[PDB]
């Protein structure tokens, strides 16, 4: 028996996701100490990110951009930070280098979108923008999503540092030097990274809604909170506890 | 690396710390005498 109808059900979430507050943000924390905004109980438009054309990179892992409105996620961790332009491919999950092992290692297997644009016109500065920094020394490379904001002195040999810089005694981080005059590889770029989450499917972060009414006691294709299949939906004697 | 006598140990795409366990079939060496204040002219990408 083929499905008679297609059903969609979502909650009463009509408020929009605050993606402007991470995409349109005067402050992006630099690569050494990146931002993270947890998105919840809201409706997005991820197609706006491809309907608009200002981006240099819009690369997706474990998802593809077009069908996305067709999913709902538990949460999104929208990570946000600023970089030089050339090293933008370091982020892509597991690729290693100086940025990935000491600043922003993405997980081996990743279910997210990496999205980036040239920011030279707003956050290059004639002083070289020494507000924006990246780490390039650490006693070990970090685990996924791990944040470390510590700035204590590192050593590249036996030479004791005692909390101050010198020969063999290193401050762990430096600026990219974002002068407005730079090659595009050394110019600043804004980046955000949307990590999606598809767990027990209690979806609070959404694509555009457009939900439909119920059908009972006949075969239909269905979607509840992004969980989906084909079946004969019926009233039931299932005494769920109120959280299930 | 730990020699008191050495006065300059510039490393080009290398480190003395990682050198001891590093295996190399072919990277040759040269010996010569210099006026100390122009020793920088050994380095790549500069003129003199």
């Amino acid at each position, epitope marked *: 028996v083929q499905p008679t109808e297609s059903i969609v059900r979502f909650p009463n979430i009509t408020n929009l996701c605050p993606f402007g507050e991470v995409f349109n943000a005067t402050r992006f924390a630099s690569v050494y100490a990146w931002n993270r905004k947890r998105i919840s109980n809201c409706v997005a438009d991820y197609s706006v990110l491809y309907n608009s054309a200002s981006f240099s990179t819009f690369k997706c892992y474990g998802v593809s951009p077009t069908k996305l409105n067709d999913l709902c996620f538990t949460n999104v961790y929208a990570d946000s930070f600023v970089i030089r332009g050339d090293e933008v491919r370091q982020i892509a999950p597991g690729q290693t280098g100086k940025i990935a092992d000491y600043n922003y290692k993405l997980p081996d297997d990743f279910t997210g979108c990496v999205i980036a644009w040239n920011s030279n016109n707003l956050d290059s500065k004639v002083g070289g923008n020494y507000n924006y920094l990246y780490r390039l020394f650490r006693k070990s490379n970090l685990k996924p999503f791990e944040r470390d904001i510590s700035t204590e002195i590192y050593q590249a040999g036996s030479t004791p540092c005692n909390g101050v810089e010198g020969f063999n005694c290193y*401050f762990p981080l430096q*600026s990219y*030097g974002f002068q407005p005059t730079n090659g595009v590889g050394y110019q600043p770029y804004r980046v955000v990274v949307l990590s999606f989450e598809l767990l027990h499917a209690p979806a609070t972060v959404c694509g555009p809604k457009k939900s439909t009414n119920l059908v009972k006691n006949k075969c239909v294709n269905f979607n509840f909170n992004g969980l989906t299949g084909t079946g004969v939906l019926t009233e039931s004697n299932k005494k769920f506890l109120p959280f299930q | 690396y730990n020699s008191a006598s050495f006065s300059t140990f510039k490393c080009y795409g290398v480190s003395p710390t990682k050198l001891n366990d590093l295996c190399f079939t072919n990277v040759y060496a040269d010996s010569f005498v210099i006026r100390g*204040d122009e020793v*920088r002219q050994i380095a790549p990408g500069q003129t003199g």
Partner: antibody, heavy 122, light 106 residues
Framework: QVQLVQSGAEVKKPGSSVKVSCKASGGTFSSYAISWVRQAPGQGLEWMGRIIPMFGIANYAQKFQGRVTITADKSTSTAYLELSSLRSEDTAVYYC????????????????WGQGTTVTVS | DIQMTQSPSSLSASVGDRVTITCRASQSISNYLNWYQQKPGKAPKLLIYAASSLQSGVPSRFSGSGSGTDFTLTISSLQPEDFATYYCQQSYSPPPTFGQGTKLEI
């Protein structure tokens, strides 16, 4: 780019404790280290300590440790010094200077200096 | 760790002449050293930020003839501004110690 500007001179008593301050002009404290130095009149320069306004972490030489303390706010691009047990030999001109601890693996290049504060007894 | 000294105590010279000054210290410094000048009570200014490297926007009136430790700075065509007191300073280890300074007379 930036020029450091600094507190006016002070006349004091032996056994006193004292306050001086320095701040950016023509720019701001974009994660530079800033440091304090004594010029005793006609002697060599003596380094007091390091602070980074971006992180608040600071250090002193043993000659000044406990005798001096320093602080800074990035919120108003300003750094502060206080000194105690005055006038064992502490009649001097006190200067801030910046250096770029987050620019290369090289340090203490005091490329810009403050206006100088005299602290003295009379 | 490191003590420093600086020599000679003073010199006398003419505008446009060549004049040389020396740093000395307890240890090998691996070229981690700076050089500065002032008129008395004025804000100091840096000339050189390694054993030899001249700072950008400083004119070619100076060179650092040194390597490893116990360095020298030369004045090159002495300016009337080079009546200033000169200081060396090690950056090799904390505290970043200065030399005792030296005076040039016109």
């Amino acid at each position: 780019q930036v020029q450091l500007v600094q507190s006016g001179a002070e006349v004091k008593k032996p056994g006193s404790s004292v306050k001086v301050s320095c701040k950016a002009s023509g720019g701001t404290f974009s994660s530079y280290a800033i440091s304090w130095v004594r010029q005793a009149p006609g002697q060599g320069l003596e380094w007091m300590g390091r602070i980074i306004p971006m992180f608040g972490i600071a250090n002193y030489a043993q000659k000044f440790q406990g005798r001096v303390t320093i602080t800074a706010d990035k919120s108003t691009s300003t750094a502060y010094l206080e000194l105690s047990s005055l006038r064992s030999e502490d009649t001097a001109v006190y200067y801030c200077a910046r250096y770029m601890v987050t620019r290369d693996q090289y340090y203490y290049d005091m490329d810009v200096w403050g206006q100088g504060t005299t602290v003295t007894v009379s | 760790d490191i003590q420093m000294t600086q020599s000679p105590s003073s010199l006398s010279a003419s505008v446009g002449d060549r004049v040389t000054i020396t740093c000395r210290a307890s240890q090998s410094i691996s070229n981690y050293l700076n050089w500065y000048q002032q008129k008395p009570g004025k804000a100091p200014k840096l000339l050189i930020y390694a054993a030899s490297s001249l700072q950008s926007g400083v004119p070619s009136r100076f060179s650092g003839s040194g390597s490893g430790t116990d360095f020298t700075l030369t004045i090159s065509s002495l300016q009337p501004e080079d009546f200033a007191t000169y200081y060396c300073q090690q950056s090799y280890s904390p505290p970043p110690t200065f030399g005792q300074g030296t005076k040039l007379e016109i």
